[PDB]
Amino acid sequence: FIGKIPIMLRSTYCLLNGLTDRDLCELNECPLDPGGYFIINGSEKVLIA
Amino acid sequence: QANQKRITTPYMTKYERARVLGTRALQIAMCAPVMVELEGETDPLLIAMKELKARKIPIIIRRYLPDGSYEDWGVDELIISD
Amino acid sequence: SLKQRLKGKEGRVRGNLMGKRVDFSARTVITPDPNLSIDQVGVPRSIAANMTFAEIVTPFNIDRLQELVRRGNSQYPGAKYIIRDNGDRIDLRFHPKPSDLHLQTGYKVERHMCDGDIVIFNRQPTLHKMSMMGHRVRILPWSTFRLNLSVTTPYNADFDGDEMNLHLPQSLETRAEIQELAMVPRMIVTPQSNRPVMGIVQDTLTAVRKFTKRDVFLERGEVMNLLMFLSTWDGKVPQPAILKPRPLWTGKQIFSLIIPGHINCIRTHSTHPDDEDSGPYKHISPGDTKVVVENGELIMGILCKKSLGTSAGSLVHISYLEMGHDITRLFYSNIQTVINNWLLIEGHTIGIGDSIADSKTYQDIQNTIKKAKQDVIEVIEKAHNNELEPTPGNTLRQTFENQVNRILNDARDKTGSSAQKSLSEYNNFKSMVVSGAKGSKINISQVIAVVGQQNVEGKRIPFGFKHRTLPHFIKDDYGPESRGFVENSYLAGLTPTEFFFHAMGGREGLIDTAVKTAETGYIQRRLI
Amino acid sequence: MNAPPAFESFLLFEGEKKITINKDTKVPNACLFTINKEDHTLGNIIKSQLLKDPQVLFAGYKVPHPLEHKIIIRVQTTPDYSPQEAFTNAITDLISELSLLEERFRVAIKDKQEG
Amino acid sequence: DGLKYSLATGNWGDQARAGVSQVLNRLTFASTLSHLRRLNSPIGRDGKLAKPRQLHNTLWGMVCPAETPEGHAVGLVKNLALMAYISVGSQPS
Amino acid sequence: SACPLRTIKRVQFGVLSPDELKRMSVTEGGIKYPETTEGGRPKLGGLMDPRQGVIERTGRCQTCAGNMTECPGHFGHIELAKPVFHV
Amino acid sequence: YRHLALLCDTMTCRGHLMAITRHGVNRQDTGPLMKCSFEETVDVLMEAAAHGESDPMKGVSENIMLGQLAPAGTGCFDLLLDAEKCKY
Amino acid sequence: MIIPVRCFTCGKIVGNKWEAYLGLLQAEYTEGDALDALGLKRYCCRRMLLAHVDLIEKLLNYAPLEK
Amino acid sequence: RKLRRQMDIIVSEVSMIRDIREREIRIYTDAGRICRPLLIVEKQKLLLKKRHIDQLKEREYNNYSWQDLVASGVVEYIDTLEEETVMLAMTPDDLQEKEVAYCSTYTHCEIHPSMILGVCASIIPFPDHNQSPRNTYQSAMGKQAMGVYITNFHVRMDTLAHVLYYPQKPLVTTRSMEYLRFRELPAGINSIVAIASYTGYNQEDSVIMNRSAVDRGFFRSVFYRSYKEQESKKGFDQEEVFEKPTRETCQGMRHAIYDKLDDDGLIAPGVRVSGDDVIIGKTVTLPYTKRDCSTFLRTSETGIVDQVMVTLNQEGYKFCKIRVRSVRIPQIGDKFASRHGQKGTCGIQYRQEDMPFTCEGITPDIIINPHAIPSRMTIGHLIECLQGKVSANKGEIGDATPFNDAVNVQKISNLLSDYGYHLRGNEVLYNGFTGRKITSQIFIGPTYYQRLKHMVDDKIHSRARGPIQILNRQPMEGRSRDGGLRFGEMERDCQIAHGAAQFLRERLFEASDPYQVHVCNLCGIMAIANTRTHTYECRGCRNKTQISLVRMPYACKLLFQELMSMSIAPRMMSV
Amino acid sequence: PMIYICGECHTENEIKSRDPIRCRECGYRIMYKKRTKRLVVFDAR
Amino acid sequence: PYANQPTVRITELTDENVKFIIENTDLAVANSIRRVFIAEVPIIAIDWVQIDANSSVLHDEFIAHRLGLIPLTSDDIVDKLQYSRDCTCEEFCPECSVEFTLDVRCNEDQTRHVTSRDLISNSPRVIPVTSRQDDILIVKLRKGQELRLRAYAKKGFGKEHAKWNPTAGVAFEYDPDNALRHTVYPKPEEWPKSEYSELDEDESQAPYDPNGKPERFYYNVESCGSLRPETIVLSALSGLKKKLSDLQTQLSHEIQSDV
RNA sequence: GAGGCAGCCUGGUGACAGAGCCUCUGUCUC
Ligand SMILES: [Mg+2]
Ligand SMILES: [Zn+2]
Ligand SMILES: [Zn+2]
Ligand SMILES: [Zn+2]
Ligand SMILES: [Zn+2]
């Protein structure tokens, strides 16, 4: 073990990946929330290009 | 300087009018005597303007010249524009 | 470091001595109120309860100040503190015992800001002394500051969410300065240009123009409505301009009661033709386009911005010169309150009807453009044939670009005057362009006829691709379509390329706004 | 925070007079009526009814400001007829019109229900 | 903590270019969708040169012509056209 | 106060004489210790010297009845073991 | 024009092109307190200290910084109680 | 979220017409005929149902705090 | 080109550029190139045939998707400098045989020209009918419109959120608004807008609103404020705890109210909270026997506790969030917008009695001034009110996509005629106060308006001897601190030009940082002064007998001490 | 004690001063404060 | 010098609306009549709510907002209730309020629509209009969600809040062919003719009448349901008469003090 | 990726977030 990489939500390495709309609602996720951001210390963060 | 060879104009400037009224209003609020028969007025800044238009405010204006001399003008000696 | 505490902006001198944060000040959004005098401001009742003025106790007022103390801070009419001769202050917020409600001469009571208190009122950037003027307080419901719309002209204010700062003067000696030096009525005329800084504007100006036509006849019940708003009126109803078959007054005849004293003034309306002063009817003006005020009475002519605007020698300038500030206060206040109440009968609007022209006009516009574009093709044929020869001192390219700019500037103005001639006297764009309240004859041309050439840094749209403007055009295409001539009106809608070129031109205006707003205080600081 | 309570548009506070009568000193036989907690609903009918009286020389109304709920009505009359009488008359004429209009609506109802 | 710190602060280096990693805007859904599609040019905001702020011809179909912020950021902060795709790269082998 | 109120009619700039600093300073032996505190309370000749001002929001200072607000703060000095350039 | 003139007079009254730059101002005869409010606050006061300069307290910024009635407008004159006219 | 009780402009009740409106659309009515059949004559009322978005059908996917 | 279209050896994202005059061929597989899909054109024909649309229609259950369109060689990704080498048709109209031939060798075709716009620019109807600065103002204002921001907003404890009660989808919609999911999560309401000069309260950019619509919930919203709080153990023997404080144990106890707290030291949801109510009781042990760290509800709010949740943080200390809600019924001063850069505050609210009404009894929800239109040339705002009046009557949602040659203001006018309205959308109104017809026929229609994040009760502020800074002893900074307003350099510049010297010394001194120093007469340096002993001294001179009192700003005393720390002697001479 | 509701299995559990927050029967770590019992009055406006 | 003598025709009457025509009255009176229809006819509507549980997806004042808007049958008891300002009791009593109750829990496995049908009242006179025509949806509940609340309805009128406005609309028209020229059409041929128009297809306006004034006012009062549409109109005429006779009394008392 | 001044400075206010033990960043408003 060398460290932790923060994972981009709904990326292929997220736990929300591939879930269907019915599954995300069980997690209290929004099915329309696009992901594509990180959570750090509970704050959603966007890497502007 | 004496009341002779005054070179400043006999008009009271707006700045002198502003400060004379402000000063006299503050005096009237500090229970100075009133030099005019008031007619139901009670605001010291309205009484001040009544004393001004009557020419009754007991103030002398000292106007400094840029050479460092000064002229004294009684408020009654000055013409009021308004 | 110690130097860094002092170095400059936000350092001690500039940051805390040449400017600083102050007690007894308030800020909120501003909103209109046409029911205010130019010398009034509408203050939220919460703000008026939060800010106090220390009033000295005297036998002239102690009976009143005992009540405001006895009401205390939970009421709006009340006081926050009593200051003793010692400077010891009783706080009235938390119920003090009767020993501390005692009042004697020379105490200061921190009474709440009342109706008729005087305040300085300001908007940043404070570009000239007319951006800080004295107002008289009127307390109102709700949380915004209200100012009369004429007073928006000095401040450069508008009600799209602007905020303004109120400063409450705290002593009679500085209360008197603001009254005697800085009140809005004393600020009507500016030493920068001896013009008046305040005019009539927006609805009142478009209504003023419409109200003053010959066509405006008013029945007895309408007149008695308008005359209810004149504060200066003497109570004498004027004999109507028409007595039979039906009593009718005229708009000019009631405006002649708004105009103060015996002012004498002459102006022209914006549409006054060039010939009319030289041919017959030098007087008895056909279109009523020549304004004549005599003895304080509006004898003839349509009033507009040329007459009641902020320019020199306007009817409202001459009012200030002849009558002074105290009366010209009332002149601005009366023009608005009667003529905004008349616009409840006329109304005003703009819609899709006003942005449309006859099928005759649209064919005139299309035939103008179709020739202009074919003329530009002829100039190109000359250049490509090497038949074009340069103007003196100019490059061949500069010659070509000037000739093409010539043809298309002609087309923009030929179609624009065709569109304006096409406008019926009912048209509501015309009703604002002719009053001058808003808009201009180029806006009418762009909405109805042709948006025109789009420029980047004063040139036809650049070849930002290799020898062409966009991937859609072939290379070396100098024609009007290729280089950013928007041959469509806003009603016709832009084509895709025209929409992009119109964004390229609009961006330069957005950049230059940011650059010029990035400088507003710079020169004024160095000068001062 | 600064919202006026909505009942304060029509309920008087303690010691508000509903009406106040002041002689207009500008011109003879003129008078000024201040009506608390009323609006265009009651101003415009009394103006219109006053304008029918041939002994009324001026009638007009305004609300001084829309955010505070009162009307001022100004009435001028010929000599030998007070504006107090003109105002009291105009009210009684409106009460007579409304009760007469009401009775005729009740009849028209029955004629429409039972027919 | 090295990957976490710059994502937490936006400072793109060891404690640098600031203003990467803004907080995701959660005022309205169009805000959120725009924030995830925003682009930034690192040129300093204090200079008065207009040329980098102008809408170049080659933004056609790639970057939104209409959307840019007010103030000193004008024309530098930009947003993608709805069908604009940014390549992710391959090896040329 | 007993003293006459006066306007300031001129400002004279200059440099403090190092003897005037010694004469002016209330830290009669100079600052000697990097520490702020003795037994938690302030160290005389340390960087919170109770003659050099009022320390606490309700305190006093040794040189005048300072009331926190009324005390202007008083100057101290460090005697530099060797002269040094003022930058 | 009376404003355009007053700028052109001030820019030239001292006999040279008085550019309104930092040193263009910091060659004026104005006092050290006014100069420190513009461009180079500390460096101005170092040279005032090293040369023992003085400020006569007769500019506006000067009297502002020390909280006294500016030599301007409503301040530029003085008032005396007419103790004789107080009789009437 | 949920259909307004009143039309904002005029005070006509529309909070009882939403489920009927969807039923009429299930019956392959147009929105025009469905609004007509419901008695929504004024365009100020027709815009209430024609433009409503029943997001409460999305809030009820999430399980409550208490079962 | 062939291999990339077949996707054989070359990934379709590879870009390839012959530069024929340079005799260079360049190939880029580099990351971070920006590119866009274009339809391929061969021999003046699209390669996209009707069969492709049929298969794309079956996408609901058939496997065929966009990948199969790319893999077929029917669309191509092209980058910002391969575009230097293409000829683009704007529509397949450009491929048609024409009497005068512009180009006969197109290589690609634009898919739809409106796809040059972005997210916030695609929620705008008829943007090809607007002055382009106003399309930019909306794209900024769109991001500030309230709506529903995400569906799971009840679990999220976001520090600020605004959710609208009754958002609607627009009656007038750009097709791209589908992909934005603006139907599912809309941010506005269709409102009846009269473009009329009414009583004048909509002058400049102000707006009049129907108060009876506001009573019925028009643009009503709720505001959510979330407070986090965190327990800890500090060192060996200091602890914070959430608990109900008490004045017999906690030093910092206010006279404010702690009885809203439960025994855990937290409120429970459903309790009514106001500014300076304690929402969390927190204490820390003191070496009284605790200091008070309780959090207070941020002042000038009133609300109700919506949720309280309690957890362990990363370190295992008790960690807490409280969410508070308050409803915001729109006031005058609240800011609204039209999707066309027509921002504006509510200037007054008139009840349904007083709003101008049509023969049908329709009052407007909003009245805006006509003077907002001529200089700004937001003609798209007028066409929306027309297309929306047709759409609300037809029972349709109107296609306001830009560059749509199939729609015209003439065609929309014709359709409006058939419903018994004047074809240009004017309507005869009656004055609400007097009932008389208005002489002008007002333009009325349904228009999509927005409520923006900016509200007057966030912004209303006043100062009157509040808190004071430690160093400067001047007023604090900013509304949140009860801060005073900055009377800046340009403000004093005006008060000089006004000659208001006594106001200027009031506002810039006696109403900010008044102070007194004693000064030695013999040298201009501050004297020691024992006001309650009546003794004074100039250490430096041994003067004990001739010392002045001098009023001066505290920030000026501070400057002179900060100058003395640089060895400068700013000697103030009173003589 | 207070009663808090688990965020994962919606069960009540009683919980108390200084007691760590964890949920019996499932081990989940977020709790909600139930809802108040004192009366609040709304205008239907 | 005295009152107008107006006359009425009723041209349509239903449970939903009345059409009627008033002739020979002032436009001022015709307008103040339609103003009273909107805002000074009293009705009963829910004004107080105490929520004892709410587990729905709407917050407590979102539901209480919707309860206020539900139209309650008012016809018979509004005249008998006092205003809550007038009654001498502390808090409420049957003299000035109508008590309502609503308890719902969704125990079934599928969405329970809570509606006006679930509001339950202390008396029969006062039920929701949709029960006195599908019921107004208050909230939708998921399985395990719950809503129980106690409410009171009170007498008031549409000046206080639009929940007390009894009308779903008020048409008002006069001079339907523009004989008075109180509006001026820039192209009169492009205007649809009014319902009450009396013109052929080709003539576009009545020719100008310089002698005329407004004389014939066309109304269409539509009820929301709290009152029958004709008892709205009778309540307005009785109320507006009461407003004027309140003036006349207080005016007479002031004359007996000016004099 | 631009000046200018003798390394620093780039026009007035304003409002919120984030990061750190009051300071810094970003976005936004007129
Ligand atoms: Mg503005
Ligand atoms: Zn001391
Ligand atoms: Zn409706
Ligand atoms: Zn000394
Ligand atoms: Zn659990």
Tab-separated table of N, CA and C in Angstrom, chain K residues 223-250:
chain	number	residue	atom	x	y	z
K	223	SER	N	-67.137	31.863	-10.068
K	223	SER	CA	-66.789	31.493	-8.702
K	223	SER	C	-65.683	30.444	-8.667
K	224	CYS	N	-64.862	30.497	-7.613
K	224	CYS	CA	-63.981	29.378	-7.295
K	224	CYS	C	-64.703	28.257	-6.557
K	225	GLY	N	-65.823	28.561	-5.910
K	225	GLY	CA	-66.677	27.557	-5.310
K	225	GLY	C	-67.086	27.875	-3.887
K	226	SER	N	-66.322	28.735	-3.209
K	226	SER	CA	-66.649	29.072	-1.827
K	226	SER	C	-68.018	29.727	-1.708
K	227	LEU	N	-68.445	30.451	-2.739
K	227	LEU	CA	-69.776	31.032	-2.811
K	227	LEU	C	-70.397	30.690	-4.157
K	228	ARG	N	-71.715	30.518	-4.172
K	228	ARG	CA	-72.421	30.475	-5.444
K	228	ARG	C	-72.243	31.798	-6.183
K	229	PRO	N	-72.132	31.776	-7.511
K	229	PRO	CA	-71.702	32.987	-8.224
K	229	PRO	C	-72.662	34.162	-8.108
K	230	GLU	N	-73.967	33.923	-7.958
K	230	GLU	CA	-74.888	35.022	-7.679
K	230	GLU	C	-74.853	35.513	-6.234
K	231	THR	N	-74.465	34.680	-5.270
K	231	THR	CA	-74.376	35.178	-3.900
K	231	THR	C	-73.076	35.926	-3.628
K	232	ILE	N	-72.068	35.764	-4.484
K	232	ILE	CA	-70.950	36.706	-4.527
K	232	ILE	C	-71.449	38.122	-4.796
K	233	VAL	N	-72.204	38.291	-5.884
K	233	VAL	CA	-72.659	39.611	-6.322
K	233	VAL	C	-73.553	40.278	-5.283
K	234	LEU	N	-74.489	39.532	-4.700
K	234	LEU	CA	-75.314	40.100	-3.637
K	234	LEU	C	-74.510	40.458	-2.393
K	235	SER	N	-73.462	39.698	-2.081
K	235	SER	CA	-72.616	40.039	-0.941
K	235	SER	C	-71.804	41.303	-1.195
K	236	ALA	N	-71.354	41.501	-2.433
K	236	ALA	CA	-70.672	42.738	-2.802
K	236	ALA	C	-71.567	43.965	-2.654
K	237	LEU	N	-72.770	43.922	-3.226
K	237	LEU	CA	-73.676	45.063	-3.132
K	237	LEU	C	-74.055	45.374	-1.690
K	238	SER	N	-74.286	44.344	-0.877
K	238	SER	CA	-74.546	44.567	0.543
K	238	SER	C	-73.310	45.079	1.276
K	239	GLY	N	-72.131	44.567	0.924
K	239	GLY	CA	-70.902	45.043	1.544
K	239	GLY	C	-70.532	46.467	1.169
K	240	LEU	N	-70.566	46.779	-0.126
K	240	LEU	CA	-70.273	48.135	-0.584
K	240	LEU	C	-71.262	49.160	-0.039
K	241	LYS	N	-72.540	48.800	0.053
K	241	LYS	CA	-73.496	49.634	0.777
K	241	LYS	C	-73.119	49.800	2.248
K	242	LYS	N	-72.609	48.742	2.879
K	242	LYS	CA	-72.174	48.829	4.273
K	242	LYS	C	-70.952	49.727	4.447
K	243	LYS	N	-69.999	49.654	3.518
K	243	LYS	CA	-68.832	50.533	3.552
K	243	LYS	C	-69.216	52.008	3.497
K	244	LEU	N	-70.138	52.366	2.606
K	244	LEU	CA	-70.578	53.754	2.489
K	244	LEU	C	-71.369	54.226	3.705
K	245	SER	N	-72.229	53.376	4.258
K	245	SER	CA	-72.968	53.747	5.461
K	245	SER	C	-72.101	53.779	6.714
K	246	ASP	N	-70.972	53.072	6.725
K	246	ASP	CA	-69.957	53.299	7.752
K	246	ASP	C	-69.319	54.683	7.641
K	247	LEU	N	-68.950	55.105	6.428
K	247	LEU	CA	-68.528	56.491	6.222
K	247	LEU	C	-69.566	57.492	6.709
K	248	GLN	N	-70.805	57.359	6.240
K	248	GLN	CA	-71.818	58.371	6.519
K	248	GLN	C	-72.044	58.552	8.015
K	249	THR	N	-71.952	57.471	8.788
K	249	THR	CA	-72.079	57.589	10.238
K	249	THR	C	-70.903	58.351	10.841
K	250	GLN	N	-69.677	57.967	10.483
K	250	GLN	CA	-68.497	58.610	11.054
K	250	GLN	C	-68.331	60.039	10.548
